[PDB]
């Protein structure tokens, strides 16, 4: 297909089209003409990234200025979803045009997910795999193999050849997805991480998640050549602010201080033992402090940096001297005073709220380190550790995280709050205190993204309402256009199940435990659907702590007894590999003849990037509306800043994100226009939250679907199963909303240009 936006010849990959795309594609071009952000509530049941990429794919071949793109999503799962769909698009481009694609796009995740060395790939945690490859070839470790042969330091054998052959050009012509890049690099003795990490400067389109554009420790390789004049797309951008909160958050524990004291003591030996090894190398880095912030060999390196910088990318950091702590021995002096001061500030009476600037002042009197020198810990630790050629790092892991806090405390103030709870409220009154610090204003990292970028697009099918986003993050949109799913068939039934078989209001707000007045209704709901519903059922509980009591007490009674025989149930578990094994055995069951049901968490990992096609989901159940008040007053302290800095109250923020989380989970059940299925939601307050539902879903929720009976909802989905499953393909009522190939788009949309 080849239609136009009056300037862009679009090489659309699907032979058929969708009007929601045309409404999206028509207006998104206007945004490209006059720059903005243009929150557009594009349908998720429709293929959003299909025309999101294809229009932008046609953008570069026509517009010659924006040679670089940014595609950012919440998880690498949606990165590869873009990768897998876009890969066909480039080959689809060669199918029609011949050889005019010249497009390069690869996903950038990490060393862990793209490692090829069997020695390194064994470990599970990414950091340990990241540490092993980095120590395999480090700016100070890999030199100790080439100049002098040793068995202490090995070689990646894939960064080695990348260092020789890979960094001279680009990958030949493939637009490699995660599945495709893994296969290619395995045979050609290359590790895919070091390709795409280097491919930042060469990829005409760059594929990476939200963290590597926002998280400060990893977004130091960002290139202005691909940042100044580029176009930025944020996929599933509903969960954008929540990520930024974690970026400036850190906890501590009484166990960690024992490790922190271990690191404090063990490094004290480490820096002193190497002094007799090479004392002049120690002092050589001291003269590197008086000259400046070590810029020659702290930022112009291929592999050297070890300590991450949680501060903004080097703009919010002075280059002055870090006080009189130059000496190795004197570095011990303030280290042991500050570690003692924080321990009595780690055993605090209860959660106390002080401005982080005041923490420096109280620190200043107990341990006289001025604010400007304390900002220099991050570049200090790498300057000192590199001299000691340290060989053991296990007890030193605490050093990088505490020093990460040290950079944060001396730099961020009057926007955040320090809290120290002496215990976790679920396991209260124990010696398990936390040095709680969490981000209150997410926009501090958000704004510099808009500071440099010129072309930005934010699009998500679950954002509801669409108005608090510009006020929360402080960015400028122009085109706030909403899309409703215009179809000739219903294909979806959002439900407000306030009343159950008992006709009793059901929820999870009353408590976080089980009760016979409530649990028997939810289980009776699960069994009754299990009798009738077709294969594919996914539920999203408000929390994982909630579900553990739910399932175990469900096992006590015979309510699951009939649920046992109906379908195949696989459960969400804390270990990701097991749940992925659970989920990989869920999709196969759904596609296979036997019915299957999946249970997950609204705040869990499943709601992040998981998709459910026809088989993988037909009827999704939502136990209540998820409220995240279960945790301590950390969020209450966080919520106060939102209430005064912004005009968004607790009530407005709580329900609108909860339904955003609710709308985030629901839309995964539908894949295309053909896809259909009931999305039942069971809570009394869902009557009031009809406003928080997205307009395309909210329109489907008429006033006649409020406070239904679940047995009636069983009849409602019984009618849904009777009506929707019919092969009703009139093929004449399609053209109103299906727009068959290259005929009704040119015929009718010319009438729409008015």
């Amino acid at each position: 297909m080849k239609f136009y936006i009056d300037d862009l010849p679009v090489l659309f990959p699907y032979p058929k089209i969708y009007p929601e795309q045309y409404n999206y594609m028509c207006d998104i071009k206007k945004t490209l003409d006059v720059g903005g952000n243009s929150i557009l509530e594009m349908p998720s049941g429709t293929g959003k990234t299909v025309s999101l990429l294809s229009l932008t794919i046609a953008y570069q071949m026509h517009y010659p200025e924006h040679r670089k793109i940014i595609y950012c999503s919440r998880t690498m799962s949606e990165i590869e979803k873009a990768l897998v769909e876009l890969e066909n698009l480039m080959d689809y481009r060669t199918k029609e045009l011949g050889y005019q694609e010249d497009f390069r796009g690869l996903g950038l995740t990490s060393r862990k997910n793209l490692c090829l060395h069997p020695e390194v790939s064994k470990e599970r945690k990414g950091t340990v795999v990241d540490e092993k490859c980095r120590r395999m070839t480090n700016g100070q470790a890999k030199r100790k193999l080439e100049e002098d042969p040793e068995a202490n330091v090995e070689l990646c054998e894939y960064h080695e050849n990348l260092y020789n052959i890979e960094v001279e050009d680009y990958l030949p012509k493939g637009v490699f997805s995660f599945e495709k890049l893994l296969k290619y690099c395995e045979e050609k003795t290359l590790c895919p991480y070091f390709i795409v990490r280097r491919m930042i400067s060469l990829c005409n389109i760059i594929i990476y998640s939200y963290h590597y554009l926002l998280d400060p420790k990893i977004a130091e390789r960002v290139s202005n050549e691909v940042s100044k004049d580029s176009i930025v797309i944020f996929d599933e951008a509903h969960n954008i602010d929540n990520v930024c909160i974690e970026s400036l958050s850190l906890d501590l524990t009484t166990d960690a201080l024992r490790r922190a004291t271990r690191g404090a003591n063990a490094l004290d030996e480490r820096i002193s033992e190497v002094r007799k090894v090479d004392s002049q190398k120690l002092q050589d880095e001291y003269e590197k402090l008086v000259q400046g912030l070590h810029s020659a060999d702290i930022l112009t390196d291929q592999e050297e940096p070890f300590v991450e910088t949680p501060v903004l990318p080097q703009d919010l950091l002075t280059e002055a001297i870090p006080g009189n702590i130059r000496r190795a021995e004197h570095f011990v002096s303030f280290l042991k005073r500050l570690i003692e001061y924080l321990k009595t500030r780690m055993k605090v009476l209860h959660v106390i709220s002080e401005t982080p600037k005041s923490f420096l002042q109280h620190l200043k009197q107990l341990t006289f380190i001025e604010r400007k020198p304390l900002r220099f810990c991050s570049e200090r630790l790498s300057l000192l550790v590199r001299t000691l050629e340290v060989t053991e790092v296990e007890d030193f892991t605490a050093l990088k995280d505490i020093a990460t806090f040290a950079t944060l405390i001396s730099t961020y103030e009057e926007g955040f709050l320090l809290i120290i709870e002496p215990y976790e409220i679920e396991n209260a009154a124990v010696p398990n205190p936390i040095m709680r610090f969490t981000c209150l204003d997410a926009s501090i990292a958000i704004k510099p993204v808009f500071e440099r970028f010129s072309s930005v697009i934010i699009t998500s099918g679950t954002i509801s309402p669409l108005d608090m986003y510009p006020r929360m993050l402080n960015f400028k949109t122009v085109l706030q256009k909403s899309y409703a799913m215009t179809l000739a068939k219903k294909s979806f039934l959002p439900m407000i199940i306030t009343k159950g078989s008992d006709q009793v209001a059901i929820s999870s707000r009353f408590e976080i435990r089980n009760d016979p007045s409530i649990v028997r209704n939810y289980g009776s709901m699960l069994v009754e659907f299990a009798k009738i519903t077709p294969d594919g059922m996914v539920v999203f509980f408000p929390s994982y702590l909630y579900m553990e009591s739910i399932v175990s007490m469900w096992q006590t009674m015979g309510i699951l007894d009939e649920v046992w025989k109906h379908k195949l149930i696989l459960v969400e578990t804390p270990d990701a590999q097991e749940t992925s094994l659970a989920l990989e055995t869920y999709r196969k069951a759904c596609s296979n003849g036997r019915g299957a049901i999946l249970l997950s968490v609204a705040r869990g990992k499943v709601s992040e990037g998981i998709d459910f096609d026809h088989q993988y989901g037909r009827t999704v159940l939502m136990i209540g509306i998820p409220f995240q008040y279960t945790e301590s007053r950390i969020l209450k302290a966080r919520l106060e800043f939102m209430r005064e800095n912004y005009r968004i109250r607790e009530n407005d923020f709580l329900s609108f994100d909860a339904m955003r989380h609710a709308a985030q989970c629901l839309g995964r059940v539908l894949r295309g226009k053909d896809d259909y299925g009931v999305m039942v939601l069971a809570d009394r307050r869902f009557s009031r939250k009809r406003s928080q539902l997205p307009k395309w879903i909210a329109q489907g929720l008429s006033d006649a679907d409020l406070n239904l009976s679940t047995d009636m909802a069983i009849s409602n989905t019984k009618q849904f199963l009777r009506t929707m499953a019919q092969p009703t393909d009139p093929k004449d009522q399609e053209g109103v909303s299906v727009w068959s190939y290259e005929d009704l788009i040119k015929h009718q949309n010319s009438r729409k240009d008015q």
């Binding site: 077709p534 296979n592 003849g593 026809h614 092969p727």
Partner: protein
């Protein structure tokens, strides 16, 4: 807005030689109440009506019935051309109530073996009464579906008010890639037309295959009463038929003689195929403004066909559904029968 056959079934090839084995399902899902009495009792009767019509329209074929109870595939009647035995088995099925769940893979494994004795000329087909939302596969069900397509065993499934991809994939895979046999049911009349559409042959695209020139016989009648006997059942048969070759007595039926093994058909098997092979064009409602016919019917005498100057009665329609080639008008009630049982168009024949 008009609901008839689009242009015409182009008469080239249709499947009369066949062996369709319907696979019923007696599962606790069929204990769930969807139909009037229940799922199980009602479907059996419409299959009972299906069996006689299937023999009525495809008398040179054979029939088999498969039931699925407690996750097991069970046959109640072998693939055979005996209408009465099939009903008799279904009565016991009707007498009993369902339990358990269906087993798709076992039936698919059963289907491959069951149609193996089916002759080459008979077009292979297995009808699946799949209503539940799960199966029971003791192995790779994708392997057996690969066997049926490779061995040229087309599968049409008759699903209930539920849509499953595996059954849809099964219909797509076996039927030479064609996905057009996944119609489902939602009503008492809705499920019957699925059986009725299975009564008629199911052509989509016939491929070029090695065609077999087969030998079949025509029997002769008997009249003896006191000498009552037959060489097929060895009973007191007061009337039967005889193969022209073996001279072995058979009852009055198209029953194949058990002596020389040559197909026996009397008149219906050749004739019932003939009206299926070449259907005429549907008698569409001729326009009232373009009628130019007298106020009556032609095939029969239906004087009612025009309201004439009566507001919303006149400019309505007319009982003037005329055949295309014959150019003879006919009432909608009459013209429907013209293409319902016997084509036998009057204007086409009266020439």
């Amino acid at each position: 807005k008009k609901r008839t056959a689009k242009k015409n079934i182009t008469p080239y090839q249709r499947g009369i030689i066949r062996s369709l084995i319907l696979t019923l399902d007696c599962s606790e899902a069929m204990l769930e109440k969807d139909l009037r009495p229940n799922r199980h009792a009602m479907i059996i009767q419409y299959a009972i009506d299906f069996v006689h019509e299937f023999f009525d329209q495809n008398p040179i074929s054979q029939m088999g019935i498969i039931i699925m109870r407690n996750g097991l595939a069970q046959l109640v009647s072998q693939v055979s051309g005996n209408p009465q035995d099939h009903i008799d088995a279904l009565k016991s099925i009707r007498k009993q109530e369902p339990k358990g769940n269906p087993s798709l893979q076992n039936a698919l494994e059963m289907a491959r073996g069951l149609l193996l004795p089916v002759p080459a000329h008979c077009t292979r087909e297995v009808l699946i009464v799949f209503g539940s939302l799960s199966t029971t596969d003791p192995g790779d069900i994708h392997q057996t579906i690969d066997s049926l397509v490779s061995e040229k065993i087309r599968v049409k499934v008759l699903g209930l008010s539920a849509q499953v991809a595996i059954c849809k994939e099964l219909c797509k895979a076996t039927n030479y890639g064609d996905e057009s046999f996944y119609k489902i049911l939602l009503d008492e009349t809705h499920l019957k037309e699925l059986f009725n559409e299975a009564v008629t042959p199911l052509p989509v695209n016939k491929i070029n295959k090695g065609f077999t020139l087969v030998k079949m016989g025509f029997p002769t009648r008997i009249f003896e009463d006191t000498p009552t006997f037959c060489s097929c059942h060895s009973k007191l048969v007061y009337g039967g038929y005889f193969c022209p070759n073996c001279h072995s007595k058979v009852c009055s039926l198209p029953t194949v003689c058990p002596c020389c093994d040559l197909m026996l058909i009397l008149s219906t098997h050749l004739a019932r195929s003939y009206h299926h092979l070449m259907p005429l064009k549907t008698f569409a409602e001729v326009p009232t403004t373009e009628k130019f016919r007298s106020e009556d019917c032609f095939s029969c005498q239906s004087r009612f066909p025009x309201x004439x100057x009566x507001x919303x009665x006149x400019x309505x329609x007319x009982s003037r559904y005329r055949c295309e080639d014959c150019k003879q008008e006919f009432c909608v009630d009459c013209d429907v029968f013209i293409h319902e049982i016997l084509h036998n168009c009057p204007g086409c024949e009266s020439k």
